[PDB]
Amino acid sequence: AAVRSQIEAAVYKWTRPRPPRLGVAVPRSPPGTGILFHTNMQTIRYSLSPKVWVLVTGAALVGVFSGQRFAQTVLLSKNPPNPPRYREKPPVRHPHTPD
């Protein structure tokens, strides 16, 4: 539990997002400007920060392929060698051959 909190606090500190490098030409907000809008505005989707998104998405990818390996090695089985192919007698006549 001590190690759990340690790694949890280590990940958290590293992932805290930095301000975005805006790829758009917007003004600077006037200084001292607080909340102007309200919560009835059309909801804006809550998006993970890039670092966090990579971490969880990477955990998902590592998870699905490790799950694929677990199924392949434990749940599934390999083909045993094919049965020996011995000479066998074919039927004497085709069932539809006129007599």
Place this chain on the structure above:
Amino acid sequence: PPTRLSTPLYSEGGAFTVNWWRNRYGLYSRRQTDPMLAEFLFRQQVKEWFYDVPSYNYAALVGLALGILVAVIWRHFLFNPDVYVRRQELRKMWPDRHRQFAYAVPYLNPQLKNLLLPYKNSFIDNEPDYADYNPVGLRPQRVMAIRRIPGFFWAIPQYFFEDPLYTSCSTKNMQTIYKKLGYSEL
């Protein structure tokens, strides 16, 4: 893209330029009734269609498709032994059409056919070389490729030397097995 009509638009010389396009854009237009309005509408169209980055992708696709199309048409007329535009050979019975028979073998062996036929082993598991040998000589003898076709062929190993069963599935081993039984010649 300038926003003021006072600032001129640069044009190259030639048959497809900004000046060439201006001369012809308003030929059938009822809306370009004076210089100011005509220029405004002209720049509006140029801004919308020629300063649109994704539009250039379609220009590439039309050129590529049309180039292939023109060439395949031309190739049939110029080289296909079965397409006749001249009449000398069509005024003779089939056994006498020597000039047209000259197109036959060269047309039967295009470069890409020789280059890509060896890669049939990426589509056939058993005896991919079943049709390689031919004693007549109209076409070259075929040798199976050493690598899988690049792209979506992940189901087969990248190189056939990596595959364990490749050699045992060849038409040569299959011929050995069946010839040992007296079953067939091939």
Place this chain on the structure above:
Amino acid sequence: DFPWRWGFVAEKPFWVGAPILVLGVLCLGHIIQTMGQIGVRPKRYTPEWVEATKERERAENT
């Protein structure tokens, strides 16, 4: 503003009605298509014909 049939259907939760309706429509379709073949017994589906086909498959290695 709607007739009885729609007032009845539209009153229920969609995921209560929808699943039942899907099965019902499918069942009715099968019932309709079975009415014209009640008692029809083709000879090729009898056990004797079923065995004979197995014999043909064995001979032909189908």
Place this chain on the structure above:
Amino acid sequence: IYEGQTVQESELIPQEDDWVIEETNFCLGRNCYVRFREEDDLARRALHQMDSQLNKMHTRLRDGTVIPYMSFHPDEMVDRPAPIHTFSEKPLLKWTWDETYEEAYDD
């Protein structure tokens, strides 16, 4: 690509410290099938339909200007249902440019 109108920081500076974003409802109201009176005849039911047009509605802002019902295409600008003759006065598509001429001004 279009990314909205450009804003200069000077235009974002309030004239009072209590200014917030105006909370005006842009939901026009509660509607349903247009309900005609039985007493009304064909002519008077036509008047009723003409008075229930959503595209004739607007929202008035705090300064008295109104933001109208707007649409990307002119299909939503005719009366619903569409009358026999719709655009008697040619709809005007307003283009903007920076050109000007002296005759329009006076000193």
Place this chain on the structure above:
Amino acid sequence: YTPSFERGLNPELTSGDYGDMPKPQPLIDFFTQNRNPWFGFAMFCGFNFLWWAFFGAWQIRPLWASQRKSLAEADRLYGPTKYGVGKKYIN
């Protein structure tokens, strides 16, 4: 069905007086839709179709039992030889 009052992760935020407003409930209620019998029938209905969609109805099996025993005997006695697990399948 007189559902229970689930306080949640932060019980202090559910400690007020709800009055007429509904109180939070356990998640089993959401899956059962408050143990509505018609939703249970609808749930059973959803499984029934999906089983038909992927594997077939499997409701015809009791009726097909005798005719699946005749098909199995024919395949074994007269059909082409099956090897290993292949003998499990009859067509």
Place this chain on the structure above:
Amino acid sequence: TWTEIWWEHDPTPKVAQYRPYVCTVESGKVYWWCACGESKTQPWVDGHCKCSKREGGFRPRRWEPEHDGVRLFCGCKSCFSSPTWNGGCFTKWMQSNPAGGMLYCFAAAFGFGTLTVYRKF
């Protein structure tokens, strides 16, 4: 993260719970949802939180069900489909505890990988 790093002029809620609230709702009745996370009658406005007092840009969120039933409601106060829940509560939790988020995502992906591989193989 729109309120956290991109835009500083929208009200920012407090997370009441990183799990949805399950409630029975009735058609024809209007419900008011807390958008600040400080109400003591979650998921509803209690008359004493920011939303009720119209303070700091917080207002109650009107909601009305089409049919009767049990519906999930947002506890994180940031779900895209708020007041209803769509999974944003888990997403917002991962932002706040990225190490935990990875554990759950790995476990979910592990199960999905095993089942899909076991059936297809």
Place this chain on the structure above:
Amino acid sequence: FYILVNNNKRIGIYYIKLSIIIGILGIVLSYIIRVELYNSGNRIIKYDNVNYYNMVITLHGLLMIFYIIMPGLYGGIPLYILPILSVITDIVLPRINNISIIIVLISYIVVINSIVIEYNIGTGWTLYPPLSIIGTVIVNMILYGLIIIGISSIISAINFMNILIVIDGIIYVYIWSIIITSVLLIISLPILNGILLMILSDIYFNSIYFILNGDVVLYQHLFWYFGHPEVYILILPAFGIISIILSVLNNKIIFGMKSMILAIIMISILGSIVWAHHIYTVGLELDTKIYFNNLTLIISIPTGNKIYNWIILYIGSYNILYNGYQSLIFSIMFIIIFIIGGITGIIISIDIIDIGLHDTYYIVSHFHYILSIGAVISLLAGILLLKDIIGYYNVIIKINKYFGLLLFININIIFTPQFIIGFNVMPRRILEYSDNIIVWNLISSIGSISTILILLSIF
């Protein structure tokens, strides 16, 4: 008046009304086909009346293509909104617009009358010779209907092209969709007329084009030189509708408008040069096959760009807006369904795959997913969007989640199994089949009866 009216909006209503009427006959024929195919044996058609089945499949195809979907998506919605989108008072050619709808009705009456009076035989909707030219008079009557229909199509195309001369606003994507379909008609129809005249010459004028020393494969070239442009003349108006619905309902400006427009132009040019993918199994030259296969796969590029531009239109739209409206659901369903149909089209485009899948029910399911599902739903979605403007009532469709769900589920029950039997394999244009294909055929038949029942609930 009723028949004399020249109002472009009234004529648009007439086109939709007539498409539904003629559509009833189309659906009935489809029910006959699926009923027959429920098991092996004869079910509703006698073995001595097998010629009727051949006629049923022939008329089904012809009516649904030329008398239902084309009059509905290229005549109905276009004649009602195009002059409004163009901010013009009315259509450029009023009198021509009137005669076009009358022509369609008259050609329909000729076709159905030929069912009643002539001997019932069939040769497919593709009227391949020599079979088409050794038939009875019903084939002659069908030819007259097609030629008459061709007149209406071309004059309507001329009508839409004239909008460029009068348009007072901006050419929206939808307007571009109709204009390009009109161009495709002006260039493809004259070739069709010529080959149809040659079919008539062999039927009625003792011509010998389709007898030995005359190449029957010639017909297939000229027919399909119109055939494939036809499938895009039927889909492009649907694409135009989808663009309007997604932008309007999501309150989002079309993204990549110029790429949408240039994608439509590209599809048309390419669609005019790929026809021989319908003739892969005849025995064409290797280089021809490779050309056509290559160019056929290229059409996916412009078609793919449009699909992804639609997706981003729906992405990001406000959650508060109710998304259960039937028009929105149908528009979204079109993207999901069209991708299935197109991908299977790319599969059949590979000629070697096509050898196995030509003249099999895989081809059926392919073009049904695009037309019977995609095009129908697009026309429904477009009419639904214009319900207030058109003003029709007495139906429960606008908000009906049951109808959409039941339709989607059951339509897939019909045609998804037809992909399976394509590798079984069950040929097309047949009524009897081996007993080991009953399961899938039965499932699809159960789907057909169910879909019909759902059509009654709208009233």
Place this chain on the structure above:
Amino acid sequence: SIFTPMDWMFYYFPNYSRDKVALMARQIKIHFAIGFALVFLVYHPPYKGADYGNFHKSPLYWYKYNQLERSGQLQENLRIKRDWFYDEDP
């Protein structure tokens, strides 16, 4: 420009892109010539491309070949696993 984002062409080559109409024409012409050349220089050339003794063997081919050669896998892979049809019944 082939497989080129034209936004990049506009930025890095401003003078070459000044006339956007002419730029569009070159785009069409360049890709037209590419398609034409492929048919008559890659497909058409007769009696060419049949040198199967010159199959290109890339650096990756040799890396994987030598690895298997070093071990016995290459010999084992090439060995014929079965050259008889019937097993012997005891």
Place this chain on the structure above:
Amino acid sequence: KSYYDDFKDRLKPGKYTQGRCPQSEGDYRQESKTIGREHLNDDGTRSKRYTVKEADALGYHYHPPIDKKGQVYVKGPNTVIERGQTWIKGYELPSMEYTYGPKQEDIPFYPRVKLNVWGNYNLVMKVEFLFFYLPTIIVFGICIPVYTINFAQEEVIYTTMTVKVTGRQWYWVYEVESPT
């Protein structure tokens, strides 16, 4: 609350199927005799005489609307002079309760919001490039396989036997070389 109860009074249930009495009880097909209603039937629908038999577009009841001075009646605006300025008061449509019925109260709030636009030009351009060229790559990935398989079907093989197959209505004829 139930909004239907607010305007229940206006909706009086009907008596006749399709809202008309049998023609015998009242002849709705005839033109109304009421003054000023000569263009309407008794039930209020337009009479066939007005619309078909004597339609003005066909030259019946010729009455040019425009007067000598090229003018037609036009209704003026509601003008209100005030504060040394002439104002026009616009016509506001009646309450939606009057036209639709529901009482206009407890309306859900939908705030003003400018159009939802995609930003970051550079990012958008790259996506559009991918929207076009990812399919192009896939097509190119199929091209080489397509050529190879086509070449394979059309391969000159050393065939040693010929079977001729003719298709007739409705049977298949087969011609095969007979052993010598």
